[PDB]
């Protein structure tokens, strides 16, 4: 059983959902075997080795995005109160959670780093009309989308910075900096945190939300030759899954004030909703993508990628009733 | 079954070792039930609540001490390589571990806070003749003992500061600060850490060793009315057991560089050796104490206290093969 084989059957839609879930679950189970140590002594030795190594280091059309994701195209874990919470409500609930945890108050300058399609930017701007809300994104498409939404919603307190955060230089400081599902993509965390501190004053607060494992850190990459999933989903080996505590060791330039995690079932419910909505709008999605992609085969490839991401994400975050992979949140002030 | 009852039978030597161990083990088991939460979400909420609360806040004759403890009267967890390691060897092995983990080098100024009988002070002074080693203790007896030992061992590089560390004021800085089994007694940790930072330069390192639980923090005090042990051992409610990670949240003035724990079986072997040696020298011990104490009953009381401490300590640190309560160590530099 080779991976070239498994990829073939996967791309040809010949693996049933039940089998696909089972295979991915098995791959995550192996990640758990790799990460858990028999003693806390060894667990910390392993975790500290990961932290020390860290310290030495085509866009989807928005119409397609709107057909797969919730209303504000949130691309991060949402928050589900009820069994009946829709993805749209879940988006809103997690926006309000961030506002509370980050102590957003009317009149503050707010910076959202890696703002995506700007669901959070738009939420804060509308809710707090005296705040000035800046999103920062490296994507031209995202900037354009946010600006269009701000205009449609009669929001005058939004700007977007188009930039690679790791290169962006400014003397500007902000009362509140929010970093949502972005730190996972950052090559140099110590330098990232340091730069963020330079955009803060003594009164600023920094809020970070990231997917985590409760116990250990890992790069999102294949353990063994049998793992076809990790490299399929992330073909760059560029996503890091920090442990729930990893950022505690990155207080060179910022100091922790609070620390939470959100159980993984919330993220699981998120990716499940995306998957279902994508399945629902499958034909429309296929039509939307065809122009920009060329082939209907290249279409199916993109769709398979996204759907499998959702299928795998479900197994990942729901493992052990959400008590393995989950979401970590931290609040810091400047040193 | 009242506690007044249990204390009576205990002081009258009418509780067998097997029963005594069982009762204490049960008390610790209840502490575990109290500390472990069903989700990491709740575990952190509980742990952060403990950390936030923190941020709002007659001497035994040395001859007796020599008859109960190892050669250098180390009053902290030792380190046992073999089944045949004596308490004396265990003392030495943990001294060398500290020297490595704290990166002690010949020629440094070294400060040992809460230095006790100065086993570590004497070890560094003898091993590194160009170091200057200062112990700081609040006990006149300890200062006297260390000074006598330094004189006997022809050590010219030792001084002792007699002081309450929480009141001590000095402009003096040191290359290395060591804090061994002392932070557990500190009322205000944030202020303690802050003061330590003022005794450091950019080149200094701070090493802290403390008893911990791997998962949660707790005051060493009775949970319920059935716990006769906690208040017997520590009648002041003045000992805090931080979690293995708690000090990560105290980086206002210092930054973490490394983090370890030592499995609890080492501490268990420590208190067991003390208990056995005390049992061995029981008659001598009783004789030594009689002058300073008056009654032979007051003697038995002190001995019961110490022995029960050892008996309980064994159950505490050996719980789950040393994977509950254990020893945490951290290395920091100044901010
Ligand atoms: C997983 S998405 C999170 C989007 C948004 N925060 C949300 O929660 O929906 C990661 C975001 O970070 C952006 N990003 C990644 N690397 C970046 C970089 N170096 N500079 C700026 N933005 C970056 C991506 O384009 C995207 O907007
Ligand atoms: C558990 S003993 C540890 C002794 C020694 N470090 C060892 O490992 O054997 C705690 C030590 O801290 C000292 N101590 C406690 N509170 C203190 C304070 N406020 N100032 C100075 N020393 C203190 C005690 O007298 C004792 O020397
Ligand atoms: C295919 O495009 C994407 C769609 C949605 C997300 C949301 C989210 C997320 C959700 C997961 O379930 C996951 O699995 C490890 C990884 C990530 C990494 C980035 N972010 C934290 C990210 C994307 O790159
Ligand atoms: C009776 O006098 C003592 C003798 C030995 C110690 C060693 C050690 C220690 C060992 C334990 O096993 C323990 O149980 C929680 C608590 C403590 C607190 C202080 N220190 C970290 C401390 C003493 O106060």
Distance to chain B for A99, nearest Cα, Å: 18
Alpha helices, DSSP H only, in B222-327? 229-233, 265-280, 282-293, 296-318
Distance to chain B for A80, nearest Cα, Å: 15
Would you say A102 and A205 are in contact if contact means Cβ atoms under 8 Å apart? yes
B148 touches chain A (CB under 8 A): no
A265 touches chain B (CB under 8 A): no
Q: Which of A223, A213, A267, A225 lies closest to A87, judged by CA?
A: A267
Distance to chain A for B148, nearest Cα, Å: 37
B321-B324-B330 Cα angle (round to 5): 115
Concatenate the DSSP letters of all residues of A159-172 into one string.
EEEES-TTT-----
Residue B9 domain-assigned?
A: no
Q: Whose CA is nearest to atom 15 of ligand 3?
A: A313
Closest alpha carbon within chain B to A44:
B260
**Overall number of domains in chain A:** 1
A241's tokens: 């899954």
Residue A88, exposed/middle/buried by CB under 10 A (0-12, 13-18, 19+)? middle
Catalytic-residue membership of A310: yes
User: Residue A26 and residue A191: Cα distance in Å, rounded?
Assistant: 35
CATH code of the domain covering residue A41: 3.40.50.150
A255 with B252: Cβ contact below 8 A = yes
Place of tokens 């790799």: A34
The answer to whether B281 is annotated as binding is no
A259 touches chain B (CB under 8 A): yes
Would you say B330 and A44 are in contact if contact means Cβ atoms under 8 Å apart? no
CA of A24 to the centre of ligand 2 (A): 53
**Chain B CB contacts of A249 below 8 Å:** 248, 256, 259
Q: How far from B325 is each of A135, A142, B149, B216, B331, CA to CA, in Å?
A: 46, 50, 33, 10, 20
Would you say B179 and B152 are in contact if contact means Cβ atoms under 8 Å apart? no
Four-point Cα dihedral B133, B137, B141, B143, nearest 10: 20
User: Residue B163 and residue B140: Cα distance in Å, rounded?
Assistant: 9
User: Residue B68 and residue B154: Cα distance in Å, rounded?
Assistant: 26
Would you say the C-alpha torsion A198, A200, A202, A208 has a positive or negative sign?
A: negative
Residue B35, exposed/middle/buried by CB under 10 A (0-12, 13-18, 19+)? buried
A100's tokens: 């509370």
- CA B197 to chain centroid, in Å, comes to 22
User: Residue B8 and residue B119: Cα distance in Å, rounded?
Assistant: 36
A249 with B248: Cβ contact below 8 A = yes
B263 with A39: Cβ contact below 8 A = yes
Provide the domain limits for residue B239: 24-334
Concatenate the DSSP letters of all residues of A285-302 into one string.
HHHHHHHHH-SHHHHHHH
Nearby residues of A199 by Cβ (< 8 Å), 6 or more positions away: A111, A170, A172, A173, A174, A177
Please report, in angstroms and rounded to a whole number, the separation of the first and last CA atoms in chain B. Answer: 53
Q: Which of A334, A185, A181 lies closest to A262, judged by CA?
A: A181
């Amino acid at each position: 059983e080779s991976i070239g084989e498994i990829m073939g059957k996967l791309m040809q839609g010949e693996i049933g959902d039940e089998e696909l879930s089972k295979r991915i679950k098995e791959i995550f189970g192996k990640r758990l075997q790799w990460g858990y140590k028999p003693t806390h002594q060894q667990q910390l030795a392993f975790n500290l080795d990961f932290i020390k190594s860290l310290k030495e280091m085509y866009e989807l059309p928005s119409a397609f995005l709107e057909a797969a994701f919730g209303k504000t195209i949130k691309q991060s874990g949402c928050y589900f109160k009820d069994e009946t919470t829709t993805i749209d409500e879940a988006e809103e609930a997690s926006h309000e959670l961030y506002c509370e945890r980050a102590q957003i108050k009317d009149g503050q300058t707010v910076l959202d780093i890696g703002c995506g399609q700007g669901g959070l930017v738009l939420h804060i701007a509308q809710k707090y009309k005296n705040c000035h809300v800046t999103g920062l994104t490296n994507s031209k498409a995202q900037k354009n989308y946010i600006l269009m939404q701000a205009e449609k919603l009669q929001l005058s307190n939004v700007d977007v910075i188009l930039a690679d955060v790791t290169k962006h230089e400014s003397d500007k400081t902000y009362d509140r900096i929010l970093v949502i599902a972005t730190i996972e993509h950052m090559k140099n965390i110590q330098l990232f945190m340091k730069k963020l501190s330079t955009w803060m004053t003594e009164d600023s607060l920094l809020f970070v939300d990231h997917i985590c494992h409760k116990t250990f850190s890992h790069h999102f990459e294949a353990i063994d030759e049998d793992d076809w999933y990790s490299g399929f989903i992330f073909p760059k080996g560029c996503v890091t899954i920090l442990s729930a505590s990893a950022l505690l060791y990155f207080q060179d330039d910022v100091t922790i004030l609070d620390h939470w995690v959100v159980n993984g079932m919330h993220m699981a419910r998120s990716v499940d909703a995306w998957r279902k909505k994508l399945d629902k709008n499958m034909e429309l999605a296929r039509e939307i993508l065809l122009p920009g992609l060329g082939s209907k085969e290249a279409v199916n490839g993109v769709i398979t990628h996204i759907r499998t991401f959702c299928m795998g994400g479900y197994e990942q975050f729901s493992y052990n009733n959400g008590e393995e992979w989950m979401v970590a949140q931290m609040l810091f002030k400047k040193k």
